[PDB]
Design a protein around this nucleic acid. Structure first.
Lengths: 116, 99, 83, 208, 100, 151, 127
RNA sequence: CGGUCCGGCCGGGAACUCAAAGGAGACUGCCAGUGAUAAACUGGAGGAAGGUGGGGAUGACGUCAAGUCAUCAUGGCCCUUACGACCAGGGCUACACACGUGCUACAAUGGCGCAUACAAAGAGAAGCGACCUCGCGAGAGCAAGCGGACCUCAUAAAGUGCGUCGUAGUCCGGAUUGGAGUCUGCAACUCGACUCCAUGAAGUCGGAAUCGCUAGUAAUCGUGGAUCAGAAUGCCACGGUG
RNA sequence: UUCUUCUAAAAAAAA
């Protein structure tokens, strides 16, 4: 009920609850439960500490929040100080995968700034 | 057995042609199955008719490829030489296939 | 990106040029228009003037630029704001 | 321009195609291109001779083109001299063995293409457009046509602003599909630009 | 369209037929899984030396009568405007205005 | 419209009960052409309505409908300079249409878990003379009463 | 000794065969409930056979191609009516009143040039 | 009917679906009423269809000096060591903002997982590409059949049955971004499509206003084609529920 | 019941 240093929900099913960890989605959660021999429909409550310990050992094999944010930020920072096109686009805060920018770039640009 | 496939853009012409084929087979030899009508392929196209800008002004054309199938169950020599030497009107495409 | 089984792409003229450069050890900037070529380990420490449509921008190749294409470090759009 | 082409709208009812052959998609485009080249060459060569229609048909990998013209003596001249000269160069252009037949056009004053070329030649040699239109309509109506409508358009009489003039005697039913309206156009390259001529000829309703 | 564009088209189609076999052979070598890295590397290097216009992908289908690069139709080899003109005059067999 | 009053089109009745207006109800309730889903919802709502009412599903549906059917409604005339809401009597087919539409739009606004449960609760309250559907009925009746002077 | 009918709907074609028996309905070598899980479909199939009281006096051998659930169901109903009209020759006066003999000819309207669907025009803007 | 590996599959049969070709059929043809002894209108009898049965093609004289000299043709004006021509790289994909047309949504008439049922219309030789093996997957290797009512694209989806989620920014929604790849093409950085893992913005039905639709229509769900080496939420067609 | 205004350049044929 506490995995990877964060508290995961309890009333939720195990396969859903595991996704709360930064670095684990639905498929990775399924793979974890399969390796640990735990059914997907069981909740985080009414589950033994030994099973939860097996879950911790299984999740340890992957990369989760602590080093994942560090490496993601490191890659983004790498691009920016590297001076590549993606770096310049990142520092300017615009879409980097070659999207249109004349309109529909709201997620990277935030809410509209009116002309003054 | 010998199979003949007729393709044409004019249905009246293909009907006349297939009637001629079954007649010319029936005269020299015999045992022609009959003039089977195969499905007509309607190939359609849609083109813009304005030279510069009118997206809602278009023409819808089609090319109907009519098809006919005839075959001789057991062909003789006086059947096969005759149909080889015989020629038909332009616009009809014949396809000889033995076996 | 390019499929792994086909290998990386680099123009033959640029390949010969970087070979001559690393052999003679000269330090003059190699000007080129080859924006579509990937960086190889021997090109580290060299200055290559990649074309940007108007001029030949000089870029100093470091060890952190190997897996990228040269054109990423020579931006072609010039923009300074609207206001 | 609002009205659909009369020959096109009647292509399966009463009017025949000007090229009747079959070809699969592999050789359809180059066949069409070959037809265009031979039509262009023939129209360029036989400008003086009143050529009305160039029907093309290719049975068993051999092109056979039948020209419909109103002056066969002019196009053949001495017996078998230039028809072979046209046949060889057409066969060379198409790259397939050719054969050229010639059909005479009885009553050339009731043929849309020939009237258009006559009007266009008269325009090119600077006659009054009204005079040419009246002469063509009177000649056609005298020879027994059920109806003709001619239209001439663009910078008439050397004017500054273009206009369209048209005459119509008799019936010219363009909505009736079974009416065998012979329609054709032409254009005159005068010293003040290009003048367009259009002509519809209604020969009588076809039943069946 | 310009005569220059038509000239570029005929030049490209000529070079494509001229170098068709060599490009096919080189692509087969590169795509071959049972080939060493060094020969595949030499093949991708050799492929560049061939004239750029010799590639099949370099040509754009233009209307055979006017060289218009837009609105092409493969079955007729012409653009939409020339297809309509030819159809309404009767040069394309079996073609007529459809209705259904 | 202007020229011709069209002839009324036929509707086949529901399979389970053979009722015409219940079939009309499922037609009104359906969204995106999913008649099967709509049929499942109305059948479940009726099956729980039968328990809560102790009567047959047709009778319970009808008594619930009767408390939602209006008898007079306002229609705009505007012969004068302002909007004249004239109260006009409502014909039976339109009465049934209005009742069924109001019930459906009320059930779509309730906050229960399933549409079947929403529809069942709405029908029970309607039979019990409560809810936003009968509130809408009293509102249109009150408006027609206040504007009863024009006829 | 079999009695045949043909029913058609939107795009479906149903071939029915009538043989005297106990009332077995089989469609494409499957039972009616097995083939048509939808209750409205089951009702429209049984509609002529419960209009005239011959529900249990004869068996139905049915084969249907093309269409969808409701289309195949309507086609089956049309075929049953057409087959009954020649099997009995006097039920027509009642089936016509019930509107069963008529072939519903409402086909799906084709899409048109300029329109986004059969009749739906694209969104229009003045300014 | 005779046999079956239970598969129209195989001897066979030409009835049926269906595939085309010809013909019949719907014309106010018949009856009653209204009407000026008319034209015509309302109603019913037969009939699959009743008054234009449904849809499409078909656009008068002309209007807007409407649109196109950048599809093409063409009078005149302009350049001819350049306003002509070739090549590489860049741009047409930029971005404080405003508008038009769409796609996906805000959820329980739903999302996810498993099992299962019914289509139509097309395209295919520098092409469509079965089956088998490898890969979680996009796909790769070998590779029959098909110029095609035969083979391939291609298992349609909504539906139905079971299970779970329980009104939450959620097992809704997939934007954005990082890492690893596949395919086309000399060449996916600017600037292609798709896949795997991780990430999960805004959005809880929308102000003033405004648009489409009278029946197999609106709404909704998939499928194909043109363009095309690759590259659609657009366009043009097709069917399912309704 | 109220509902105002649109400056300033056009061309049209001659048996």
């Amino acid at each position: 009920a506490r995995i990877a240093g964060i508290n995961i929900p309890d009333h939720k099913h195990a396969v859903i609850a595991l996704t709360s960890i930064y670095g684990v989605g639905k498929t990775r959660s399924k793979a974890i439960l399969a390796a640990a021999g735990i059914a997907e429909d069981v909740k985080i409550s009414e589950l033994s500490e030994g099973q939860i310990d097996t879950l911790r050992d299984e999740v340890a094999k992957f990369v989760v929040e602590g080093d994942l944010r560090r490496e993601i930020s490191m890659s983004i920072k790498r691009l920016m100080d590297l001076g590549c096109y993606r770096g310049l686009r990142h520092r300017r805060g615009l879409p980097v995968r070659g999207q249109r920018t004349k309109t529909n770039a709201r997620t990277r640009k935030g809410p509209r700034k009116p002309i003054k | 057995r010998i199979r003949i496939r007729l393709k044409a853009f004019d249905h009246r012409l293909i009907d006349q042609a297939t009637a001629e084929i079954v007649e010319t087979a029936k005269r020299t030899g015999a045992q022609v199955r009959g003039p089977i009508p195969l499905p007509t392929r309607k190939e359609r196209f849609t083109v813009l008719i304005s030279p510069h800008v009118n997206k809602d002004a278009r023409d819808q054309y089609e090319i109907r490829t009519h098809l006919r199938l005839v075959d001789i169950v057991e062909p003789t020599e006086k059947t096969v030489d005759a149909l080889m030497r015989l020629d038909l009107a332009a616009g009809v495409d014949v396809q000889i296939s033995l076996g | 990106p390019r499929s792994l089984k086909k290998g990386p792409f680099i123009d033959l003229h640029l390949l010969k040029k970087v070979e001559k450069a690393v052999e003679s050890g000269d330090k003059k900037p190699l000007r080129t228009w080859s924006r579509r070529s990937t960086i190889f380990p021997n090109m580290i420490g060299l200055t290559i003037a990649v074309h940007n449509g108007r001029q030949h921008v000089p870029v100093f190749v470091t060890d952190e630029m190997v897996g990228h294409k040269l054109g990423e470090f020579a931006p072609t759009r010039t923009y300074r704001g609207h206001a | 321009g609002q009205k659909v082409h009369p020959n096109g709208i009647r292509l399966g009812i009463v009017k025949p195609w000007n090229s009747t052959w079959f070809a699969n998609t592999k050789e359809f485009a180059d066949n069409l291109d070959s037809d265009f080249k031979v039509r262009q060459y023939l129209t360029k060569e036989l400008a003086k001779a009143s050529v009305s229609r160039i029907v093309i048909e290719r049975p068993a990998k051999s092109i056979r083109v039948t020209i419909h013209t109103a002056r066969p003596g002019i196009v053949i001249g001495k017996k078998g001299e230039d028809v072979e000269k046209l046949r060889k160069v057409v066969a060379d252009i198409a790259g397939v063995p050719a054969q050229i037949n010639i059909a005479e056009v009885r009553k050339p004053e009731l043929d849309a293409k020939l009237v258009a070329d006559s009007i266009t030649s008269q325009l090119e040699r600077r006659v009054m457009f009204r005079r040419a239109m009246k002469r063509a309509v009177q000649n056609a109506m005298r020879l027994g046509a059920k109806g003709i409508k001619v239209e001439v358009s663009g910078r008439l009489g050397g004017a500054e602003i273009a206009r369209t003039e048209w005459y119509r005697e008799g019936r010219v039913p363009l909505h009736t599909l079974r009416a065998d309206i012979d329609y054709n156009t032409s254009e005159a390259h005068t010293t003040y630009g290009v003048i367009g001529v259009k002509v519809w000829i209604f020969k009588g309703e076809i039943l069946g | 369209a310009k005569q220059s564009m038509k000239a570029r088209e005929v030049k490209r189609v000529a070079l494509a037929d001229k170098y068709f076999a060599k490009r096919a052979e080189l692509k087969a070598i590169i795509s071959d899984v049972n080939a060493s890295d060094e020969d595949r590397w030499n093949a991708v290097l050799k492929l560049q030396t061939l004239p750029r216009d010799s590639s099949p992908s370099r040509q754009r289908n233009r209307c055979r009568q006017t060289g218009r690069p837009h609105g092409f139709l493969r079955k007729f080899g012409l653009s939409r405007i020339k297809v309509r003109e030819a159809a309404m005059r009767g040069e394309i067999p079996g073609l007529k205005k459809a209705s259904w | 419209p202007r020229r011709r009053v069209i002839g009324q089109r036929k509707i086949l009745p529901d399979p389970k009960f053979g009722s015409e207006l219940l079939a009309k109800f499922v037609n009104i309730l359906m969204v995106d052409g999913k008649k099967s889903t709509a049929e499942s919802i109305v059948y479940s709502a009726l099956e729980t309505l039968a328990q809560r009412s102790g009567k047959s599903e047709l009778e319970a549906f009808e008594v619930a409908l009767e408390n939602v059917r209006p008898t007079v409604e306002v229609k705009s005339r505007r012969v004068g300079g302002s909007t004249y809401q004239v109260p006009v009597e409502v014909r039976p087919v339109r009465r049934n249409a209005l009742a069924m539409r109001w019930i459906v739009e009320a059930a779509r606004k309730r906050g229960d878990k399933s549409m079947a449960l929403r529809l069942a609760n709405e029908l029970s309250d309607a039979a019990e003379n409560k809810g936003t559907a009968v509130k809408k009925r009293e509102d249109v009746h009150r408006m027609a009463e206040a504007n009863k002077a024009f006829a | 000794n079999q009695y045949y009918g043909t029913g058609r709907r939107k795009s479906s074609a149903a071939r029915v065969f009538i043989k005297p028996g106990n009332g077995k309905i089989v469609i494409n070598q499957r039972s009616l409930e097995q083939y048509f899980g939808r209750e409205t479909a089951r009702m429209v199939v049984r509609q002529p056979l419960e209009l005239v009281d011959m529900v249990e006096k004869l068996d139905l051998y049915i084969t249907v191609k093309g269409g969808g659930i409701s289309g195949q169901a309507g086609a089956i109903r049309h075929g049953i009516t057409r087959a009954l009209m020649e099997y009995d020759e006097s039920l027509r006066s009642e089936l016509r009143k019930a509107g069963f003999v008529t072939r519903d000819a409402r086909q799906v309207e084709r899409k048109k040039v300029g329109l986004r669907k059969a009749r739906r025009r694209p969104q229009f803007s003045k300014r």
